[PDB]
């Protein structure tokens, strides 16, 4: 299971000002950037060309080059068609990719208007998603008249997207299968509740994403353990914290247990009150302003 996504964001401030920015993610590694400031899709990995030839890449890059300038000018004209209806500023988002599976896939192209998902390319044409505004019917009828675009979109969604990704997965096999070891430390904070403490188990610098983290008393996993969101790191690693709320006093005898692939069995076990936890804590002292109140 691997999802390849081209995310595009276009801003239209008024009748003349506009910018379109796009990024490209495979799984959760950014492979391509293309800023409005540049007229060239940039590789962000030494393997972002996949298994494509130079001449194969130029044709695809030019395809999109024509697209960017055409897209902008199309939206502008549609706004003019719905002159009194919709008006600036207008925000458009395109999410277009394909998900890989024994040589089988499913492609998609989703379009959003003002942060809301309204249109997708389904089969041979554009389609208004149930729960779309009724004013969109005309502009869709206008776009569907283009036999030429429909042809190119279909070729990309049906054939090109899957053919390209298969190339990226073998070209980027090395990077997508890499193993980075997480490091952990401990801390605490006042709970929202009177006379309670929230303990924090910081896990940072690990790859890949999936990871198990739990506060425990020996064999018993504390059920109150809350998983935080996964937070990014510049070097494409991950930061995740697991918290535990406790009544000031239950703190000792607890432990933070971290399981990850890159450890291979040797789990990280931080004990609240160990000579190691103590040495770490005095290395991180501070005036405590402006702490989160």
């Amino acid at each position, epitope marked *: 299971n691997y999802t390849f996504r081209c995310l595009q964001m276009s801003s239209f401030a008024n009748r003349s000002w506009s910018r379109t920015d796009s990024v490209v993610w495979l799984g959760d590694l950014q492979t391509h950037r293309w800023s409005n400031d540049s007229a060239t899709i940039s590789f962000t990995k030494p393997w972002s060309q996949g298994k494509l030839s130079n001449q194969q890449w130029e044709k695809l890059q030019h395809m999109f080059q*024509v697209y960017r300038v055409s897209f902008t000018r199309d939206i502008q004209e549609l706004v003019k068609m719905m002159s009194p209806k919709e008006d600036y500023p207008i925000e458009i988002q395109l999410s277009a990719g394909c998900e890989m599976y024994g040589n089988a896939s499913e492609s998609f192209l989703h379009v959003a208007f003002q942060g809301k998902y309204v249109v997708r390319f389904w089969g041979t044409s554009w389609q208004t998603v149930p729960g779309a505004p009724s004013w969109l019917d005309l502009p869709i009828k*206008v776009l569907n008249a283009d036999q030429g675009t429909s042809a190119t979109v279909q070729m990309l969604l049906n054939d090109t997207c899957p053919l390209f990704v298969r190339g990226l997965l073998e070209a980027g096999k090395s990077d997508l299968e890499k193993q980075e070891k997480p490091v952990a430390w401990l801390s605490s904070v006042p709970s929202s509740a009177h006379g309670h403490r929230q303990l924090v188990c910081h896990v940072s610098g690990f790859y890949p994403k999936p990871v198990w983290v739990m506060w425990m008393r020996g064999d018993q996993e504390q059920q109150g353990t809350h998983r935080g969101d996964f937070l990014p790191n510049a070097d494409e690693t991950w930061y995740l914290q697991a918290t535990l709320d406790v009544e000031a006093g239950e703190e000792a005898g607890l432990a933070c247990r971290v399981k990850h692939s890159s450890l291979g069995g040797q789990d990280i076990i931080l004990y609240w009150g160990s000579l190691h936890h103590i040495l770490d804590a005095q290395k991180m002292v501070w005036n405590h302003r402006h702490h989160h109140h």
Partner: T-cell receptor
Amino acid sequence: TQVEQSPQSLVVRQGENSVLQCNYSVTPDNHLRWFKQDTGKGLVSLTVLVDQKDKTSNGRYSATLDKDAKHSTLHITATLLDDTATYICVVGDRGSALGRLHFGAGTQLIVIP
Amino acid sequence: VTQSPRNKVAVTGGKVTLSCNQTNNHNNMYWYRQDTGHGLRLIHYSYGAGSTEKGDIPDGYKASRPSQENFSLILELATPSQTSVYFCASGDEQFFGPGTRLTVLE
């Protein structure tokens, strides 16, 4: 200009073959169309060229398009007197209602009896 | 796709309207002008009843679309430079009107 035609004027003997050229730089290039304009009237569509390498044919008129060359050619086999008109090359950037046509300056065909 | 007037002699600073009427049920209409050495250039165009949009050279020109059928080019103050042959068009493939020869004098 984005649509260039050659020559300025073409003079052919009646009952011979006349050839007209068109060169464009319009990106993108959805289709191409040749119009006929009689002296003192409007433009009338002779033929369209849609494909990457297209070749159309209507009556004595026949046209060819090469989108990689960005170029087109109109042929009139066995030119008549009544073919004395201006011929206009037009390229249309989009294949929808949101398109914008680009007009060449035209070629004046004069047929000598 | 009818045009009226077919011919017009105007003075500098005089108000001139060029009408254009079509019964094809088309939403899009255009106003071009032809000048020797150039090839047709876009003045004003419309996406429907109540729409008017500037083209490549809208200066000295105003447009109006009262109904689906009609689309007029209004010249408030006329210039000698606005002496040209004006073509109207409709359609989504365009269809071109007979033309209007307009001379504006000092």
